[PDB]
Amino acid sequence: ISVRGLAGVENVTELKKNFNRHLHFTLVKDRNVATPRDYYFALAHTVRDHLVGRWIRTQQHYYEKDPKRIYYLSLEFYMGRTLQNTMVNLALENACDEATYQLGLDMEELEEIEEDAGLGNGGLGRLAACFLDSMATLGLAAYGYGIRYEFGIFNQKICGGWQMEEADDWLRYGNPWEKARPEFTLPVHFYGRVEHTSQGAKWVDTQVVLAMPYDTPVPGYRNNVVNTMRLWSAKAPNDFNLKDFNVGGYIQAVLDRNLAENISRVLYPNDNFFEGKELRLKQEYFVVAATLQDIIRRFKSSKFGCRDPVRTNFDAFPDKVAIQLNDTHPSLAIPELMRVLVDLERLDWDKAWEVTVKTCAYTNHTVIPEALERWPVHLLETLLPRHLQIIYEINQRFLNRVAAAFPGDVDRLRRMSLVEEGAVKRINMAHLCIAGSHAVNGVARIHSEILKKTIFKDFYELEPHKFQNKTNGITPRRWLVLCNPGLAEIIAERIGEEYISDLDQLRKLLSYVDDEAFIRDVAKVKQENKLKFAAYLEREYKVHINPNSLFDVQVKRIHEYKRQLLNCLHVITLYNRIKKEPNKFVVPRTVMIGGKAAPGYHMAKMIIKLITAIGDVVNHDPVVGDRLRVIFLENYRVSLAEKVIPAADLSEQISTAGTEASGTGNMKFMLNGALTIGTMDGANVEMAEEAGEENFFIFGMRVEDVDRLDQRGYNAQEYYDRIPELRQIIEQLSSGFFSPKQPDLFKDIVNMLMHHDRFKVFADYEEYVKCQERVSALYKNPREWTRMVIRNIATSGKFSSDRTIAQYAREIWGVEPSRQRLPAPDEKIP
Amino acid sequence: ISVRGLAGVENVTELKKNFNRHLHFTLVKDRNVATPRDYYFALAHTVRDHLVGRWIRTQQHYYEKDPKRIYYLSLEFYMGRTLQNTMVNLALENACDEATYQLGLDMEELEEIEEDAGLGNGGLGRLAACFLDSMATLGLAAYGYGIRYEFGIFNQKICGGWQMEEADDWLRYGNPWEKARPEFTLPVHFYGRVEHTSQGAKWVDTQVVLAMPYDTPVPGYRNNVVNTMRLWSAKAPNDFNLKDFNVGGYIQAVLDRNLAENISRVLYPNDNFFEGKELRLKQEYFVVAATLQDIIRRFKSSKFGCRDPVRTNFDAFPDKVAIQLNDTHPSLAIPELMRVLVDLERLDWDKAWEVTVKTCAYTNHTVIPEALERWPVHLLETLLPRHLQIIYEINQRFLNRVAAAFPGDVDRLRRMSLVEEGAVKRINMAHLCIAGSHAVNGVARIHSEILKKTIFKDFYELEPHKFQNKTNGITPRRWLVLCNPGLAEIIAERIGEEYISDLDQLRKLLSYVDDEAFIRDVAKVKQENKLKFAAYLEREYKVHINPNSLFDVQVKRIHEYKRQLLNCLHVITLYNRIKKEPNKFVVPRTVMIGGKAAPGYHMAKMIIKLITAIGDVVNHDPVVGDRLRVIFLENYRVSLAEKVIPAADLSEQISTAGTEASGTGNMKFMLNGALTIGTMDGANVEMAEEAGEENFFIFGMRVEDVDRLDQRGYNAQEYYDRIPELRQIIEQLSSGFFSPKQPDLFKDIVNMLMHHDRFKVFADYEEYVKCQERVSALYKNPREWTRMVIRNIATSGKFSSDRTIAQYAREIWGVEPSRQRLPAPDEKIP
């Protein structure tokens, strides 16, 4: 059937009876009233059974051996569905497929019922998920720590061409993967004040919110290792949240509990944008405060909570603990670690600081200013008074370090301060992270260099040793084996299966680049993939596309820097050329644009309306025929990504050079047989470098050109004046060609494009359509297109998150990865 | 070990491995980290497994055979713990006891970990629970319908002698008994307006709240019948509760969902008191609206949703459906049934009314005016506009009936109206229920007569046929076998086990009233019970009592009509007599008073403070010694009741004649070997009638005497003037004898007692202490005390809820009870 494992005789039988046990005993249903949803849960529960045994021995193992622990703190974990992934990592896919078949059910149909774990916005959240999978696969004693939002990223609905947001009640029917652990609930404090008494400061008169943990298993790839993702839920104490007496109402007091519990109710839908709301800041301290107590408790036990030197010496803390800050969101971990060490454990400042810096590491994910976290001091002052004091003290000592290193450099001092003066005083969270971490890293080579040359230049001059790079990657399990079994099978037919956990082996595919059978196969799976997606489209969303055309897709969050608008300009250009010479041949294309716009991002929502507007015109022009279709992919999410990417021919990664830190979607397309048209931005540089620029469609300004233009001054009028095709489009938008009933509908877009384009869309226009012509030319030559594809796939190995994690492990965490199978799952009951 | 069933060889082994399966696979724990709480859940899950098989066949059965269905609507269901009860009804107690023993665990210790299902306030809520057990035991196709409050009755804490309320988070660790059924979620409407168009009225522009059901199994006693208790939970729709656009905030819109969900957040802690709050009214329509849709859906299928006459003829609706209104709380079921039939199904008014009256029945539970539901019209007008219109129309036609029956009786008309004029117009829910039901019943013979003679006199003259009586009862399973296995065993040794489902058989115990061995045994279990409680007291609450003294206990909600104050006067009297003649012998007593006071009931909370105040003085007087102890039983609830009642010697049922509708605690004490001192009120009359007044300690005014006094006019001063002992107590309270630091602390109680005692406490004082002397006299004669006890126990059979339910079934519902074992639980998988 494929190498989705063995469909053993004993195990298919075993699976079937357990499916039945759960349908009866767990679901309390009988075959006569069971619905596909019930069948999905019976299976889910049956699959979950297979990893509890391993989950328990893995955790027990780490307790016995006691290795250095890795704590990945992140406010986002974009998990997606977990049924198939679990079957894949446990070599259960074929067995389950067989058993459910014998039960008369279609596994694929049941898989579609699983709701996505949308606890993320995009890249940052998904990176965290891929990392978790890789850390488990590399046998690292790693723990993912975050918040269990009851409402993840909103589900997007397009009404009249506009995005409509609606709550993502992903828990409505329950989550069979998580395990509530109410017995490990911890208290978290807010507000209050600071008392300075005799031997130390005291955080007093605080409001208490409880953090209840929920554990979700994270299985490694076929190695019997099952790590843990602990997500905190906010709960109100039953005392004070009722007991602070003297009139108000008993009923009201109980109803008001949903005020402390709002902390984990919803994820903020902002991608690369900072919103200084109190609720967010509360979410940030909540996950940090709860997590740290859990980390210290585990440390207190270790082998110190037995003997060792005997005396809670936190000197070995960094040798046993490593906490990674996914961006600045969990940055309060630094002053909080200090607070506990200094205030509670009573360590001297300097010893505490040494420990903190040695256990913390920060990862930066963007260079755009509006994405930077700068919290107003009056907020921190009210909500976390002691942390503010600690931050000021950290700042004090840090700046003294600077003064001593750069005597008299008074401007440097203000520039490096963790405290920003002005309208309102703010705290620069990024500066905090650099100061209290022993390592700071970018997510792509150029991004990392930019940090050193620009944004964090001063910090780099002070401590050059802290700055590193760790190019992002993606997991070949979900992003290849899971979503593209067809491609994985033909690769395995030639080079085996060891590449799933050793992606570098894909290079061996280079020697089949002239193989006639392989070229035919690679081309066949892609065609099969396109047919399946073209079908899904009519199934779930309804209104035809042509599977023979070139599948041109750009899927990622809607942003001005991602330039969906530049993609739009090209689409309209194609349209206008066709209307000019109708009877001239052009390579057919289905351009698919999908992505979510943050609810308050007006421009982003305007762009979505533009895309649908273009489709309204283009898709109903008889002269165009089936040569050009414009489709907006609704509710783009992980599960939807697993469907489009494998069916894509052209991947669009056209952000303005220097704005996309790395990107990961680009990697997903490269490993799944799509060709890339893009700019020398983020990881695109390393991808073209790996496959050879000849096998890549690079265009536009490089970072240097962008800066040259900025020195000069960017004037869009110039481009409007010298390019008639561009002029024609702008006047089409301006006159209502695309919005008849509301002719001025797109005035904001035009206005922006002409007067405040921060991402110089026009500047890359000419080179973009010129380059688009070259991909059309090559698509006309199926054999050469597929051979270039093979050159990309065979060379994508470097972009696996196993590589990334192995580097973090060695160069930052100080641990050694291991592909050693944990001693079976085998029963056992001590 | 006892007749808690057989500890079979095959089944103890089977139980043990399933306990282990769940500890591993369900709890995801290993023996080395498992805590008593984990062990309790493994067991709970193991026990729950045994009844799903029966649960499924019982429900399938009713679907095949299609009998008349009984729907018990109630806003309260005081369930308590369900582990032991399930073991008892499934004959699993000894097997589980053995198996857990072999696993090295103490079952009793694990049982104590189960949280109480406190979804009730007192009598009314517990009656519903006992009924459910009886309906299952009598094989009735019955369904309990209510609300799944996430917070039940508050947990009571005594601080400085005052009651402190704290949220009852009974779901904190989860509920292994319920089964969420999100797939059967239904929509419920609120607000909106009424449109009158061409062919009928339309309820339009409403706000939608979703009702998600949760089913809990209700097993009959050893008959393999497992009925269902469906509890609704409020959920916000993800559309409008987000989709009603045009600024407000996406985050805020999501956080605001907890506004529609507040409907099922908390139970109103009022016992026999009406609070006209909107949230309550919403809770009342919510349970009614959701339930009715479920009822009609089931009816539409039946055997009509196949063939029958073919044409949705609701003429057979009453033949297939019976809905019982537990008090007026679910009274909106009447106008709602009309709304659906008329507005949606399009039946003519008269045919719809005929159906409604024929399927509905109302049970009245109190005669005090402040407990009567009278909803302001402006509330109904805003929240349920169409229901108000329907109610007015029902009123219109009803009054016309009256006018026609009593021509010219203009005062009768206003008195009987469902609409009350005055300050604010109100709707008398009780009048609504009488009009739209074919049967109205009281809960005790005297209570029922009072309804006919007083409160509903006019309604009785109009339709004498509607009024009936159904004396309350309690379940011998929980209230005997479960909480008093010792007594149940010795009874079984003599007369067998058939009495558990045929309590009348207890009469056979009359012939052992002179049996020397029996008297010794009855006396032995009571002593064992007292020793166990005296121990529990020091275990969980700490500060000694004497097991040889007479256990004088009054446990029930704190109310002025229950007269805990009269009990207080006696206690102080005993104290004062001892201080007067210290070296005179008196029968030792431990008087235990326990009960919860509604949060806003000031007097009730003052009485609790008084009780603790008396104990402070009495319990620390050296001259008193161990002859008199005053203890306030904290957090009285079902689970606590199962502990005290079996250990009680004297049961206090001293409400003012004519105020306690029936009472059920009194019955619990009678069947568990306690003697009753009380007034001729509620069921006390029928109990004394059944055991013989010679075996009862009756005192005080009868209803007639109360009325005579009211004609005359009640003047408490008179009693204060003629009884020196009474005078001495009042002046002790007035001067701070019981409250040194705050001498005027009890001015409200004294003031009330002297000037506004609605329950004439003083009037029954003399006859009360005189009577108390007689019980002390008889306690001095162990052999005769025990023989009187035997006379009570042997004669309590009439008070089993099986009797009550059998009567409801025959005289109201029109169904025949059956003690036929359902065809085993046996596997099966169609």
Ligand SMILES: CN1C(=O)N[C@@]2(O[C@H](CO)[C@@H](O)[C@H](O)[C@H]2O)C1=O
């Ligand atoms: C939102 N968001 C960011 O703020 N940074 C991001 O992180 C991802 C993983 O590091 C990168 O691939 C993206 O380029 C970057 O924009 C991202 O997706």
Ligand SMILES: CN1C(=O)N[C@@]2(O[C@H](CO)[C@@H](O)[C@H](O)[C@H]2O)C1=O
């Ligand atoms: C609160 N509450 C009432 O309103 N009525 C009650 O119902 C019980 C069951 O019918 C009766 O036994 C009580 O006497 C009556 O007070 C009760 O307990």
Ligand SMILES: *Cc1c(COP(=O)(O)O)cnc(C)c1O
């Ligand atoms: C991989 C992924 C992303 C990141 O896409 P980029 O092109 O790097 O912005 C965002 N959303 C989803 C659903 C993803 O799978």
Ligand SMILES: *Cc1c(COP(=O)(O)O)cnc(C)c1O
């Ligand atoms: C039986 C019961 C009641 C009713 O007691 P009465 O004496 O009828 O008021 C109240 N509370 C609990 C916990 C009960 O078990």
